[PDB]
């Protein structure tokens, strides 16, 4: 307690996710799960033990898998930290991740205040 209904969390938090999706080209590496099979990077899951991406976060909101808002924030940051862990600092993915984190920080704060 506080108790959050899945519908309130979705209503309040989805705009913050949409803000990330709206970033182009910066969201593009983040819209679906990393496929180490396709990209030929079999070490990806050795390095990244808990993968996360926007599609997965959107599904969790959509299907009521978050009980409290910090679980959502933690997944967003997991996505960021996975990308900064794995990718070189000159890479598109890395630079795009840094942009997404700037955008997210701005959106998430007033939302998290309201939700309490
Ligand atoms: C969070 C994503 C991630 O950490 N990856 C794990 C790392 O692999 C990649 C990955 C994605 C991209 C990438 C880039 C640009 C895109 O649109 C503009 C895009 O759209 C789908 C994807 C690039 C990746 O790597 C591209 C090459 C792969 C071969 C080595 N080289 C250094 C980078 C996946």
Swiss-Prot record:
Superkingdom as given in the UniProt entry: Eukaryota
Annotated consequence of substituting residue 35 to R: Impairs binding to acetylated histones
Mutation effect (residue 99 to E): Abolishes interaction with ASF1A
Effect of residue 94 to C: In RSTS1; mild form; impairs binding to ASF1A and acetylated histone H3
Location of this chain's protein in the cell: Cytoplasm; Nucleus
Interaction with histone: region residues: 43-89
Post-translational modification: Methylation of the KIX domain by CARM1 blocks association with CREB. This results in the blockade of CREB signaling, and in activation of apoptotic response.
Ranges where the Bromo domain occurs: 4-111
Result after altering residue 81 to E/R: Abolishes interaction with ASF1A
Region (Interaction with ASF1A): 81-99
Subunit composition and interactions: Found in a complex containing NCOA2; NCOA3; IKKA; IKKB and IKBKG. Probably part of a complex with HIF1A and EP300. Interacts with GATA1; the interaction results in acetylation and enhancement of transcriptional activity of GATA1. Interacts with MAF and ZCCHC12. Interacts with DAXX; the interaction is dependent on CBP sumoylation and results in suppression of the transcriptional activity via recruitment of HDAC2 to DAXX. Interacts with phosphorylated CREB1. Interacts with CITED4 (C-terminal region). Interacts (via the TAZ-type 1 domain) with HIF1A.
Disease: Chromosomal aberrations involving CREBBP may be a cause of acute myeloid leukemias. Translocation t(8;16)(p11;p13) with KAT6A; translocation t(11;16)(q23;p13.3) with KMT2A/MLL1; translocation t(10;16)(q22;p13) with KAT6B. KAT6A-CREBBP may induce leukemia by inhibiting RUNX1-mediated transcription.
Function: Acetylates histones, giving a specific tag for transcriptional activation. Mediates acetylation of histone H3 at 'Lys-18' and 'Lys-27' (H3K18ac and H3K27ac, respectively). Also acetylates non-histone proteins, like DDX21, FBL, IRF2, MAFG, NCOA3, POLR1E/PAF53 and FOXO1. Binds specifically to phosphorylated CREB and enhances its transcriptional activity toward cAMP-responsive genes. Acts as a coactivator of ALX1. Acts as a circadian transcriptional coactivator which enhances the activity of the circadian transcriptional activators: NPAS2-BMAL1 and CLOCK-BMAL1 heterodimers.
Domain notes from UniProt: The KIX domain mediates binding to HIV-1 Tat.
Entry protein name: CREB-binding protein
Organism listed in the record: Homo sapiens
